[PDB]
């Protein structure tokens, strides 16, 4: 049972899932409205969104007295973010500007990837070594979509029996997608293309917000119970509350290197020969060069117009 990292509006916390009766430890305090959270374990980084400060920030968790540092600003409603620990990129959703955007880990070279047919985008999860990204949208057309991490090949993978898809995660060992619906009160799973859908927790979840996974156990936050719940990822059995009395639980991850396992970066050692962004891609050679918003890629497929 891993440590669980969760946002909590005023702070980010870590709790040991084998001992959630104990009080969590505060990783970063003095926050206004921390909502999304993720990490790059190998770099010693934790990132979060703040929906009042309209920003994504980061902290260096292996240093003593390291500051909070703003890396992306002007984000009207950054309701979801994911760290690409392989390609070294930062992806996020914005439910007010209706966008999915990427940048480098320091916030540089921002590129809007999607800006059409989004209403209430929320969760976002990455499979960097396959070059795919997955997100939810709880708006007027509720759905789960996937696309290349380079913005290619966008596809709706779930569009039925869905209404408030809030939580989304991947099982990297089994190659499965899991999601939690706060209106339909359930957690389901499917293959990565949306096929072979199955119920895991069939009902009775009051208001799940974010979902993560470690080994054979799912973990999620619930806005109505103010707690983290867990159950078996195959059967939904063994449903237990492991940590409760949380001020305002938000996004959550199993905080482990094993959830970001080592793989070769297809960009190699020279940024893919790309002048600006080298993004993961689902097709060979498994990266795609890219440029900041509004900037054209030249005919070589590598160099942004200078």
């Amino acid at each position: 049972a891993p440590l669980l990292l969760y946002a909590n509006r005023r702070d980010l916390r870590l709790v040991d899932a084998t001992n959630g009766k104990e009080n969590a430890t505060i990783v970063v305090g003095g926050l206004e409205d921390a909502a999304a959270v993720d990490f790059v374990f190998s770099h010693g980084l934790i990132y979060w969104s703040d929906v009042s400060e309209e920003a994504i920030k980061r902290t260096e968790f292996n240093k003593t007295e390291s500051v909070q540092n703003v890396v992306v600003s002007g984000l009207l409603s950054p309701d979801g973010l994911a760290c690409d620990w392989l390609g070294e990129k930062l992806y996020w959703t914005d439910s007010e500007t209706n966008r999915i955007e990427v940048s480098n880990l320091d916030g540089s070279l921002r590129k809007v990837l999607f800006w059409q047919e989004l209403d209430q985008p929320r969760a976002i999860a990455l499979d960097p070594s396959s070059g795919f990204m997955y997100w939810t949208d709880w708006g007027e057309v509720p759905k789960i979509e996937r696309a290349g991490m380079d913005g290619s090949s966008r596809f709706i993978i779930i569009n039925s029996e869905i209404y408030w898809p809030n939580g989304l995660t991947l099982d990297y060992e089994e190659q499965k997608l899991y999601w939690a619906d706060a209106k339909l009160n359930f957690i389901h799973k499917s293959n990565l293309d949306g096929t072979n859908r199955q119920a895991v927790v069939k009902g009775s979840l009051p208001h799940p917000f974010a979902l993560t996974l470690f080994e054979d156990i799912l973990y999620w936050t619930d806005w109505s119970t103010h707690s983290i719940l867990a159950c078996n990822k195959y059967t939904g059995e063994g449903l237990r509350e492991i940590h409760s009395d949380i001020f305002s639980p938000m996004d959550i991850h199993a905080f482990s290197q094993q959830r970001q396992p080592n793989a070769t970066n297809p960009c190699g050692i020279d940024n893919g020969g790309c002048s600006h962004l080298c993004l993961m891609s689902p097709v060979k050679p498994f990266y795609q060069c890219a440029c900041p918003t509004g900037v054209k890629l030249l005919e070589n497929g590598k160099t942004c117009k200078d």
Binding site: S77, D79, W138, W164, N166, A182, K183, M250
Partner: peptide
């Protein structure tokens, strides 16, 4: 506002 991320 139901399901929206508050404040």
């Amino acid at each position: 506002l139901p399901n929206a991320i508050g404040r």
